[PDB]
């Protein structure tokens, strides 16, 4: 194949012009869809908070309209999924991974309406879920939509345009273009065979998507953490230890989310009426916790700067950790549309912060700031749970702009992803696709 | 297929423990080798200036001991290559790329001494070449060395251990772990078929190498540029245009580097004595320009902060650009051991800065800083010539720490890599492997 290679080497990086322009319009559409989705989620959270004001005297009526206002939106979201689009449940990254394997359909005429309005209800009701779940699946289907509409043919166009939409979808959820592309390259591409995904086209779509976000979001950053301290070489061993803690919790946490998928299914059996009513209690719990303990609910982006600034007591951090583990499993394992990605950043931040508070008092000669361990732990659950460490590290980097911590961030991620392997854990997204593909055969 | 897939998913990310520990020792050795390599270059550059002081009175003897001291070191490097390790010439990235394709041998018993000491002569004499060339090849061979010593078998260990050594070698040349790993993923892995390169092992080897670098290099950064301004949305179109200029210049520059390899070959025919004497003249030219106009010589890292702060006049910048285009081709195309990667960073910075000075005067309503285009152009030749845009962006980011420019950096890189394609260019490293493998069947 030496002569074969010479032909391929000389023909490298010749993506068809048709794919490039179509990736441009995909990114433009995915950005707008992600912007509109976020504006919708925020607008519903306002009304819910503004409604609690009109009833701030009758505290029982207060706690009641908190539960009900969120249960309705939650139920509305569950119903739209069970009735019209079952593969819009949970995150949606496993489905997009399947679609790239050519093993799951992109029913875009169904998912785009369902997932969009479904997420608005679950996310807008204050459930512990992330926008990236929705926006990645929405962006993937949108890439399929322009493939069908414009009838472009070939394996390249089918895999490329699906990939750029999914990358543009993650970028627009975090304002993180570099992390968007790494997600496709490291986690979502078919892991066991070659593919024709054009990287240059994924770039175009991520640019257009990122520009669309900046037109409607500039001057305000998702996570502002300031400039933290640096990391001396004699401190690195402390970050390796933090990763080893994440390496044992990662798989343990993956078991629970999978295990609770099963247990909550026992509750409703699969019945569209019992199921939607089950999601109404979880969604009402969150809108209630959203008032009586905000840090136990929501995506968790608000508590990340607070935790990194050492503004939480050790007690609260342990409290917040348990609470948010519970509310995250209950919400994600229940089947609501929405990601588990963003809530896992909050868990890593909180857990990291606690480790730093202990380390600060054990080693005063190191002159530590607990915040640096919060930043190193932020992307460590990602590395331990979904096993995409290169995506988490550069994603966290893009959101906190503290490059001087690249070495402890990288060491913490390796300790997590090494100890998850050696303790027999699986990549969560790969383990969900696996179970989906195993029931779509055991039905024969 | 759906049967096979479910089995593969449940067994994903289970790198053999034997491969992981060996990747750790690979990075540890590559870091020390790359550290020692840079210390060697600096020690030799020291002597050259201290010699010019003892002879700073006889300006004619001054200019001569500058030429002679550098010609000898250059000749020593050219000689070591032609005599004992012919595939240790030039960059070495095409050689390691071939090895991952299983189409080129890793003669580590030959290359490690040759490339190491060969580079000391070429790099230490002040030639326009980068440290990354050596350290990637040196780092790849070192990964092969521990595969052989410990007799590990399989395609995985052979492809992995070779890959982590090359990534660990790039990290240690730039203090850039993220750029090291991305380079394997985007440019150097076999581009047309699946491979068993384990990413987790490349990580371990990159860490250990970077830790080794930080132990002997802390508190001082390769390139310190400070915090530049941000880039407003209505200014972005200026960065797309800058990439478009890089997109047409990229292939034109690829022609010259390939073309001057041919033209310089006519001079010596292939004879180790005419060749070494030619390399002695190119290595001597640089040691002269290195004193009478330093920005025309060297890797170019020193002129990047000066250029980025707008401290050069427009007149000087164009000179530097032209001069450094000449000395870069003459040095890399001659076959000397050393990279062309870093000198292309200086070319992008210089070119961007000049473009920025025009933008400052054409659009005063934008309140621009020329430095922001220098940062966006720094990795733009990388995007147009070697066609590794994701690696250039993250490498420049890691060395300049100006993340607020990520969007203009990406727009400049895309314009470059889009217009290089549409003007009929090829990835240089892939095109050098192509010409190398085409002589191996004729």
């Amino acid at each position, epitope marked *: 194949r030496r002569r074969q290679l010479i032909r391929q080497l000389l023909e490298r990086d010749k993506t068809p012009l048709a794919i490039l322009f179509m990736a441009a319009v995909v990114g433009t559409l995915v950005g707008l869809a992600a912007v509109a989705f976020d504006k919708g989620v925020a607008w519903l959270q306002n009304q819910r908070m503004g409604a609690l004001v009109h009833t701030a005297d009758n505290y029982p009526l207060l706690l009641t309209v908190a539960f009900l206002a969120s249960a309705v939106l939650a139920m509305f979201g569950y119903f739209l999924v069970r009735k019209y689009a079952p593969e819009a449940g949970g995150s949606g990254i496993p489905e997009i991974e399947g679609a790239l394997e050519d093993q799951r359909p992109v029913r875009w005429w169904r998912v785009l309406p369902v997932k969009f309005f479904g997420g608005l209800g679950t996310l807008g009701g204050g459930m512990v879920l992330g926008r990236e779940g929705p926006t990645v699946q929405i962006g993937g289907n949108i890439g399929r939509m322009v493939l069908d509409i414009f009838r472009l043919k070939g394996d390249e166009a089918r895999h490329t345009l699906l990939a750029t939409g999914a990358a543009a979808g993650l970028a627009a959820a975090f304002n993180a273009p570099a992390a968007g592309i790494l997600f496709i390259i490291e986690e979502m591409r078919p892991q066991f065979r070659y593919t024709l995904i054009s990287i240059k086209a994924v770039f175009i779509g991520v640019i257009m998507s990122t520009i669309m976000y900046r037109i409607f979001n500039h001057e305000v950053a998702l996570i502002d953490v300031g400039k933290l301290s640096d990391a*001396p*070489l*004699n*401190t690195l061993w402390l970050y390796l230890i933090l990763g080893i803690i994440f390496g044992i919790f990662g798989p343990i946490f993956n078991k629970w989310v999978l295990g609770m998928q099963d247990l909550l299914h026992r509750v409703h059996g699969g019945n569209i009426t019992k199921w939607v009513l089950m999601g109404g209690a979880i969604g009402g719990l969150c809108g209630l916790l959203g008032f009586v303990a905000p840090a136990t609910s929501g995506g968790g982006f608000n508590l990340i700067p607070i935790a990194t600034a*050492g503004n939480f007591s050790m007690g609260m951090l342990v409290f917040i950790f348990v609470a948010r583990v519970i509310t995250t499993l209950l919400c994600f394992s229940s089947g609501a549309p929405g990601g588990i990605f963003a809530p896992m950043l909050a868990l890593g931040t909180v857990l990291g912060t606690a480790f730093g508070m202990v380390a*600060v008092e054990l*080693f*005063p*000669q*190191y*002159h530590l*700031e607990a915040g640096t361990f919060a930043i190193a732990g932020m992307g460590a659950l990602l590395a331990a749970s979904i096993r995409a460490p290169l995506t988490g590290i550069i994603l966290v980097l893009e959101m906190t702009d503290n490059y001087q911590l690249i070495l402890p961030m990288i060491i913490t991620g390796l300790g997590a992803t090494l100890l998850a392997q050696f303790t027999g854990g699986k990549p969560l997204y790969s383990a969900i696709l696996a179970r989906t593909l195993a029931k779509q055969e055991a039905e024969q | 297929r759906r049967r096979q897939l479910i089995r593969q998913l449940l067994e994903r990310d289970k790198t053999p423990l034997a491969i992981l520990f060996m990747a750790a020792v690979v990075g540890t050795l590559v870091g020390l080798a790359a550290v020692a390599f840079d210390k060697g270059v600096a020690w030799l550059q020291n002597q050259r200036m201290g010699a010019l002081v003892h002879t700073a009175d006889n300006y004619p003897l001054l200019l001569t001991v500058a030429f002679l001291a550098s010609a000898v070191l250059a000749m020593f490097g050219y000689f070591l290559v032609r005599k004992y390790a012919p595939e240790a010439g030039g960059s070495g990235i095409p050689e390691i790329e071939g090895a991952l394709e299983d189409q080129r041998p890793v003669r580590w018993w030959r290359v490690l001494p040759v490339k190491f000491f060969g580079g000391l002569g070429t790099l230490g004499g002040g030639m326009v070449l980068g440290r990354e060339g050596p350290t990637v090849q040196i780092g790849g061979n070192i990964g092969r060395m521990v595969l052989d010593i410990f007799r590990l078998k399989g395609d995985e260990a052979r492809h992995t251990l070779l890959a982590t050594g090359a990534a660990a070698g790039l990290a240690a040349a730039f203090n850039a772990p993220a750029a090291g790993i991305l380079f394997i993923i985007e440019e150097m892995r076999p581009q047309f078929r699946y491979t068993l390169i384990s990413i987790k092992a490349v990580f371990i080897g990159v860490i250990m190498s970077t830790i080794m670098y930080r*132990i002997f290099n*802390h*508190e001082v950064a390769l390139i310190d540029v400070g915090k530049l301004s941000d880039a407003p949305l209505n200014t972005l179109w200026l960065y797309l245009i800058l990439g478009i200029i890089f997109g047409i210049f990229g292939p034109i520059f690829n022609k010259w580097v390939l073309g001057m390899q041919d033209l310089l070959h006519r001079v010596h025919g292939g004879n180790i004595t005419k060749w070494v004497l030619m390399g002695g003249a190119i290595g001597g030219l640089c040691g002269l320009l290195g004193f009478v106009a330093p920005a025309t010589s060297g890797g170019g890292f020193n002129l990047i902060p000066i250029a980025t702060a707008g401290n050069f006049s427009m007149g000087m910048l164009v000179f530097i650009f032209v001069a450094r285009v000449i000395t870069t081709l003459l040095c890399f195309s001659s076959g000397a051991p050393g990279g062309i990667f870093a000198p292309m960073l200086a070319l992008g910075t210089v070119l961007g800065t000049a473009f920025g000075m025009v933008a400052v005067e054409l659009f005063p309503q934008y309140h621009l800083e020329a430095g922001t285009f220098a940062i966006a152009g720094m990795g733009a030749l990388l995007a147009a010539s070697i066609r590794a845009p994701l690696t250039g962006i993250i490498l420049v980011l890691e060395m300049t720490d100006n993340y607020q420019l990520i969007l203009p950096m990406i727009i400049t890189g895309l314009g470059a890599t889009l217009l290089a394609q549409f003007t009929g260019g090829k990835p240089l490293y892939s095109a050098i492997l192509a010409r190398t493998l085409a002589k191996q069947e004729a």
Partner: antibody
Amino acid sequence: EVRLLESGGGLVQPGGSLKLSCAASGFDYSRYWMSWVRQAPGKGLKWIGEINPVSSTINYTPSLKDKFIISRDNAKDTLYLQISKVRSEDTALYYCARLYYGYGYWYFDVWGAGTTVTVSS
Amino acid sequence: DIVLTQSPAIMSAAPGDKVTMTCSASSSVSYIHWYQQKSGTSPKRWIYDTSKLTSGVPVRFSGSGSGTSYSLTINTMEAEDAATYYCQQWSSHPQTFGGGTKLEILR
């Protein structure tokens, strides 16, 4: 240059109290930890305390409760040290210092000239 | 705390001669720093991390040590080298200095 210029020392009666001021110039006074060290007449150096750039953590030598009180005014670019219930043992030359590190084992980077504090009736 | 007992409290040496002063600890210490004091002048950081010199320190100085017996050495002493040298450690907390070593010209 880098200049630490400390002041506020002189003569105080026992049981009294003083407040020393150290004036930084020539660098970004934030981002750095500052420290105080004193040297008794004809003796060696002794560490008082340290403070981080955001005053979130302030360590002191093992010596008495509200004895020493260190604080910083990053806007003023100034470091402070209060001594209360001053005995004759607090008669010493008081050093302002900026902290840093290499491998991570911290040292006293740049010192000030000093301020003398005499405690006598 | 960690008592750092510098050994030669006072010592004399003529220029062009080799001087070696010491530093001993009651518990193990890592990477000791050394400061030079001229009377009437602030202390200057001279040697950090056992062995590394500071920008400006002539290379005739050299530090070494391990565990509990670090040292400072001047191969060929000079006149501008007369001063006081304190060994300081911050491997444990709180940090501790030494009593000091006075070094005077001999004539």
